[PDB]
Design a protein around this ligand. Structure first.
Ligand SMILES: [Mg+2]
Ligand SMILES: [Mg+2]
Ligand SMILES: [Mg+2]
Ligand SMILES: [Mg+2]
Ligand SMILES: [Mg+2]
Ligand SMILES: [Mg+2]
Ligand SMILES: [Mg+2]
Ligand SMILES: [Mg+2]
Ligand SMILES: [Mg+2]
Ligand SMILES: [Mg+2]
Ligand SMILES: [Mg+2]
Ligand SMILES: [Mg+2]
Ligand SMILES: [Mg+2]
Ligand SMILES: [Mg+2]
Ligand SMILES: [Mg+2]
Ligand SMILES: [Mg+2]
Ligand SMILES: [Mg+2]
Ligand SMILES: [Mg+2]
Ligand SMILES: [Mg+2]
Ligand SMILES: [Mg+2]
Ligand SMILES: [Mg+2]
Ligand SMILES: [Mg+2]
Ligand SMILES: [Mg+2]
Ligand SMILES: [Mg+2]
Ligand SMILES: [Mg+2]
Ligand SMILES: [Mg+2]
Ligand SMILES: [Mg+2]
Ligand SMILES: [Mg+2]
Ligand SMILES: [Mg+2]
Ligand SMILES: [Mg+2]
Ligand SMILES: [Mg+2]
Ligand SMILES: [Mg+2]
Ligand SMILES: [Mg+2]
Ligand SMILES: [Mg+2]
Ligand SMILES: [Mg+2]
Ligand SMILES: [Mg+2]
Ligand SMILES: [Mg+2]
Ligand SMILES: [Mg+2]
Ligand SMILES: [Mg+2]
Ligand SMILES: [Mg+2]
Ligand SMILES: [Mg+2]
Ligand SMILES: [Mg+2]
Ligand SMILES: [Mg+2]
Ligand SMILES: [Mg+2]
Ligand SMILES: [Mg+2]
Ligand SMILES: [Mg+2]
Ligand SMILES: [Mg+2]
Ligand SMILES: [Mg+2]
Ligand SMILES: [Mg+2]
Ligand SMILES: [Mg+2]
Ligand SMILES: [Mg+2]
Ligand SMILES: [Mg+2]
Ligand SMILES: [Mg+2]
Ligand SMILES: [Mg+2]
Ligand SMILES: [Mg+2]
Ligand SMILES: [Mg+2]
Ligand SMILES: [Mg+2]
Ligand SMILES: [Mg+2]
Ligand SMILES: [Mg+2]
Ligand SMILES: [Mg+2]
Ligand SMILES: [Mg+2]
Ligand SMILES: [Mg+2]
Ligand SMILES: [Mg+2]
Ligand SMILES: [Mg+2]
Ligand SMILES: [Mg+2]
Lengths: 205, 121, 80, 157, 129, 82
RNA sequence: CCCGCAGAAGAAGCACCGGCUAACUCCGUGCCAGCAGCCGCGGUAAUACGGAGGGUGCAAGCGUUAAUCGGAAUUACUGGGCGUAAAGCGCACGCAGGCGGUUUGUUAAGUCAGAUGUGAAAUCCCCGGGCUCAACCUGGGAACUGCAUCUGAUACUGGCAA
RNA sequence: UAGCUAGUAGGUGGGGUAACGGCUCACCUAGGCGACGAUCCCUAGCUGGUCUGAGAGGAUGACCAGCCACACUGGAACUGA
């Protein structure tokens, strides 16, 4: 169901910073990033056309914390929806509750946001929700319950979110731990680096 | 070609035969087993390949390759047979499932133990 | 009006009955080309009115034997 | 405006009195990513020497491709030798769902999303020329408007 | 022997353009004129006549823009061996709508674009790229 | 004897009755003439719940179709009750 | 379904990693043992065998096997061919059959347009709604490449004409 | 597997069927099916659908639903809407 392994190892293999081990400190400089995937990171890969696609797919999975079976289902939904197939893949991932909770600032990492969702802390439209893959509808109000409000893990994690870019599509109160998911996320608003194109190709064959 | 020739005699679709007559689309079949013996391969290989004449339950009489290093098959001993040619021994078109029934697991195998039917270390 | 069918006669040497072919110009499902498919029917008629080889109008009716459910309506264009 | 890339590398033999001397053949397709493509074959004694020889030819032998937004204008064949090469425009969705060699030429040409399939043989050299023959053949509605001398709106609309 | 007359017309056009030939003479007919007029109307052919009383010879005048010919490709679809009649919604669009398909519908012979808006279909004679 | 009865569709522990005009002999879920609305017992206080097309009921009950114990009361629920 | 309790506590996988196919270092059982889906590996220095070992890969499953389609435009209607690769009967005549030059009529079989009936429900699809989300269930439309009739276009094909 | 077929193919008349009908009889005529596949052979429940496919197609018809068929194997009727 979850990875629960060495998280920063995934970032080296992929190369870029995946925000798995983001947390309290801003920058790591604490893994020999890029040049050490495993025992043979010095080996320059040839890297085929199937490779680059499969690396790009694994990047987007490992960022959002999703497995192949559930990720393949997002592609199937993304294809059936109107407009661009690539933009839908990412938009459906960004609409996940564990992703929204991370983007609100209620969690130093996305795994923390997932557990915070799982453990009955998160609540939306006056209803408790346990599911990380809960598709957050446009015009919703995610929030933390009064029992687990202002605990140790959340207040330190919300201060990290000030250093972050902060999305335009959602808004956060910050005083009373209350969020507001407004519109669906745009392509140009977020990332500007992870290529959807190559993921659309991989599943088509 | 010629659309009227196709009306008169349609496109006869190529009915390709199955490779493995274990019959009735069976994943495996039970074999009582007779004569366990070694055999040499074709051209570039040269070896003593382990193989046995399988008296299948349905009435067929085939040969099946015994994979892995060593085995407990002898004379009789009931064995489970899966599909799959070896591509070396001409005539052999099946494998004995290691681990199933009387065919025991291979001794001291650790990597790839679903194949060869071995337990945890 | 009644659902009649035109058709050319095949044989009339049966006493009080007539076998009639009905050419229908249906197309082939797969290949798309048309076909001149035939429908041979047994038909009832009083006396030997229509001979061999002539156009005949036919109407659906009560069964009056084993086969021969259809019945004659009228003669149009007699035998040459 | 480089966007240069390799399709195939293949070693080939001459055979002489002494023995069989091996040379290597490259196949590089280059383009701006905005309606310019150019395959360049090249051949040399060593591998990395051959791809530079291929790249020099590729830049000069360059064809123009008038294309709509980030895709083709119409469904277009482009036969060459024993490679048919069919490719459809498709929408703003999808990506370049085309074969190896057949898509290296497309992605550097500047088409972002097409349907495509290579019938007959699928030899890396001939399919790359087949695509270039297909793309060079592929006209646009601005060309077609001027060709018949009618109107850009009356044809399209 | 000379079974399809309309296919023979479209070949004389396809070969005339390949030969860089100015005009294309051939025997005339009712249907021949209808297709030649539709090709002229849009602008593949540049003018034509039907000079003759007893044995009329319809001669076309082929168009050229650059060194290249105007008629990129032209082919018979509904041929006598296999007649092809298409319904209103199922009518084709040649070259993604920048070429035409000459379709015989009731309200005279006309283009596929005209057939869609007029609200009917019929026998698609030939694609014209 | 034609009769207006509930068909029972829906998941386990989550029934959804398809009130339907069928022959008495035919099975519960099987053969029928025409379906005439529905009933949802686990709908609760919200937007939807029970819908029953009363124009079609008059066509069958007026002719000669018996109404089952439940469907008789769902007529009593939709008309008046409140 | 809700609320209190205790303490990370109870909670992992099995493929393969020459090539095709993301993933290689070495101790190797020296054409022995074995591998294998194809090409092929293994003959005292192996990414291709066992093993330890980094990963590669997948997750409560994963493999192997059987079975149908796909890729196979390798039965091709959309969409292949037949000088030399497999493939023009040794060459004629010819009924049935397929196809048929051309202008005026005339029909309306084909053909197309319309309309009405029907194409059970479920399924599929879209719009929705409902169960903590999801599978799942479910309201409402489209569709069911139909067919049948009834009335019309009659360009094109046929019929019946000159 | 190119020929099959004698209640066989039609008629008149009698009986029988809830109902028409070689359904079944008596006589009469010599037909009927067949190269747009009869006959004989092998296999097969059929459909809505299912899986697959860009689609055309290809394969299949477990579960759910409609229809047929069968009830130890071959018959026959009785009772009944
Ligand atoms: Mg799961
Ligand atoms: Mg695909
Ligand atoms: Mg063809
Ligand atoms: Mg095999
Ligand atoms: Mg192995
Ligand atoms: Mg009439
Ligand atoms: Mg009968
Ligand atoms: Mg080929
Ligand atoms: Mg190939
Ligand atoms: Mg290749
Ligand atoms: Mg090759
Ligand atoms: Mg004339
Ligand atoms: Mg005229
Ligand atoms: Mg309640
Ligand atoms: Mg009761
Ligand atoms: Mg503690
Ligand atoms: Mg403890
Ligand atoms: Mg030896
Ligand atoms: Mg296999
Ligand atoms: Mg050593
Ligand atoms: Mg290998
Ligand atoms: Mg190894
Ligand atoms: Mg390990
Ligand atoms: Mg499996
Ligand atoms: Mg095929
Ligand atoms: Mg071929
Ligand atoms: Mg030869
Ligand atoms: Mg030959
Ligand atoms: Mg020969
Ligand atoms: Mg010859
Ligand atoms: Mg003839
Ligand atoms: Mg004819
Ligand atoms: Mg004609
Ligand atoms: Mg004719
Ligand atoms: Mg009609
Ligand atoms: Mg119509
Ligand atoms: Mg309708
Ligand atoms: Mg339905
Ligand atoms: Mg529905
Ligand atoms: Mg919505
Ligand atoms: Mg929904
Ligand atoms: Mg909902
Ligand atoms: Mg709700
Ligand atoms: Mg569903
Ligand atoms: Mg419905
Ligand atoms: Mg509807
Ligand atoms: Mg519509
Ligand atoms: Mg429709
Ligand atoms: Mg459908
Ligand atoms: Mg009229
Ligand atoms: Mg006329
Ligand atoms: Mg008129
Ligand atoms: Mg006419
Ligand atoms: Mg008798
Ligand atoms: Mg009775
Ligand atoms: Mg296909
Ligand atoms: Mg079937
Ligand atoms: Mg069963
Ligand atoms: Mg059951
Ligand atoms: Mg059932
Ligand atoms: Mg029946
Ligand atoms: Mg019995
Ligand atoms: Mg019996
Ligand atoms: Mg019986
Ligand atoms: Mg009785």
């Amino acid at each position: 169901a979850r990875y629960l392994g060495p998280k920063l190892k995934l970032s080296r293999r992929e190369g870029t910073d995946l925000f798995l081990k983001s947390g309290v400190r801003a920058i790591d400089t604490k893994c020999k990033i890029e040049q050490a995937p495993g025992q043979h990171g010095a080996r320059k890969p040839r890297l085929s056309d199937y490779g680059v696609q499969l690396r790009e797919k694994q990047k987007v999975r490992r960022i959002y914390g999703v497995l192949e079976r559930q990720f393949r289902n997002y592609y199937k939904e993304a294809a059936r929806l109107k407009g661009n197939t690539g933009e839908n893949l990412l938009a459906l991932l960004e609409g996940r509750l564990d992703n929204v909770v991370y983007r609100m600032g209620f969690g130093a990492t996305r795994a923390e946001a997932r557990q915070l969702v799982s453990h009955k802390a998160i609540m939306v439209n006056g209803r408790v929700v346990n599911i990380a893959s809960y598709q957050v509808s446009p015009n919703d109000v995610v929030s933390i319950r009064e029992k687990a409000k202002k605990q140790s893990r959340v207040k330190a994690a919300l201060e990290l979110a000030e250093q972050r870019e902060k999305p335009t599509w959602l808004e956060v109160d910050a005083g009373k731990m209350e969020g507001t998911f407004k519109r669906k996320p745009e392509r140009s608003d977020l990332s500007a680096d992870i290529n959807e194109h190559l993921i659309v190709e991989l599943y088509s064959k | 070609a010629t659309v009227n020739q196709l009306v008169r005699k349609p496109r006869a679709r190529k009915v390709a035969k199955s490779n493995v007559p274990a019959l009735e689309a069976c994943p495996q079949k039970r074999g009582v087993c007779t004569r366990v013996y070694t055999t040499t391969p074709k051209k570039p290989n040269s070896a003593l390949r382990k193989v046995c004449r399988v008296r299948l339950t349905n009435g067929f009489e085939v040969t099946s390759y015994i994979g892995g290093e060593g085995h407990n098959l002898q004379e009789h001993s009931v064995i489970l047979i899966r599909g799959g040619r070896v591509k070396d021994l001409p005539g052999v078109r099946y494998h004995t499932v290691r681990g199933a029934l009387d065919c025991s697991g291979v001794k001291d195998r650790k990597q790839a133990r679903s194949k060869y039917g071995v337990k945890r270390p | 009006k009644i659902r009649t069918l035109q058709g050319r006669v095949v044989s009339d040497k049966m006493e009080k009955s007539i076998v009639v072919a009905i050419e229908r110009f249906v197309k082939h499902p797969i290949y798309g080309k048309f076909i001149k498919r035939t429908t041979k029917l047994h038909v009832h008629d009083e006396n030997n009115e229509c001979g061999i080889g002539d156009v005949v109008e036919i109407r659906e009716c009560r069964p009056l034997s084993k086969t021969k459910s259809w019945t004659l309506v009228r003669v149009v264009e007699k035998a040459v | 405006e480089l966007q240069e890339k390799l399709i195939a590398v293949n070693r080939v033999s001459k055979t002489v009195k002494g023995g069989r001397i091996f040379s290597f053949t490259a196949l590089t397709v280059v383009g701006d990513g905005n309606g310019r493509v150019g395959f360049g074959y090249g051949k040399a004694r060593e591998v990395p020497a051959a791809i530079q020889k291929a790249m020099e030819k590729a830049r000069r032998n360059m064809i123009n491709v008038a294309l709509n937004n980030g895709t083709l204008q119409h469904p277009v064949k482009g036969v060459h030798t024993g490679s048919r090469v069919f490719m459809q425009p498709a929408s703003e969705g999808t990506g370049i769902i085309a074969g190896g060699a057949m898509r290296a030429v497309l992605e550097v040409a500047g088409v972002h999303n097409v349907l495509a399939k290579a019938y007959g043989s699928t030899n890396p050299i001939n399919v790359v020329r087949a695509t270039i023959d297909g793309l060079e053949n592929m006209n646009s509605p601005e060309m077609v408007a001027a060709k018949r001398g009618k109107s850009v709106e009356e044809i399209l609309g | 022997s000379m079974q399809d007359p309309i296919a023979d017309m479209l070949t004389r056009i396809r070969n005339g353009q390949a030969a860089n030939k100015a005009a294309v003479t051939m025997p005339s007919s009712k249907l021949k004129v209808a297709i030649a007029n539709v090709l002229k109307e849009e602008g593949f052919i540049e003018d034509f006549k039907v000079e003759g009383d007893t044995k009329p010879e319809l001669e076309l005048t082929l168009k050229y823009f650059q060194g290249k010919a105007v008629v990129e490709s032209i082919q018979r679809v509904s041929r006598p061996g296999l007649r092809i009649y298409k319904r209103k919604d199922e009518l084709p669009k040649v070259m993604a709508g920048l070429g035409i398909a000459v379709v015989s519908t009731s309200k005279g012979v006309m283009t596929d674009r005209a057939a869609r808006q007029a609200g009917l279909g019929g026998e698609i004679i030939c694609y014209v790229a | 004897m034609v009769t207006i009865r509930l068909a029972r569709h829906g998941a386990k522990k989550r029934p959804f009755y398809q009130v339907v005009v069928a022959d008495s002999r035919n099975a519960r879920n099987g053969r029928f003439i025409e379906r005439v609305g529905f009933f949802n017992p686990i709908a609760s206080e919200k937007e939807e719940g029970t819908r029953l097309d009363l124009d079609r009921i008059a066509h069958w009950v007026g002719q000669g179709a018996t109404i089952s114990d439940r469907v008789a009361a769902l007529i009593k629920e939709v008309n008046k009750a409140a």
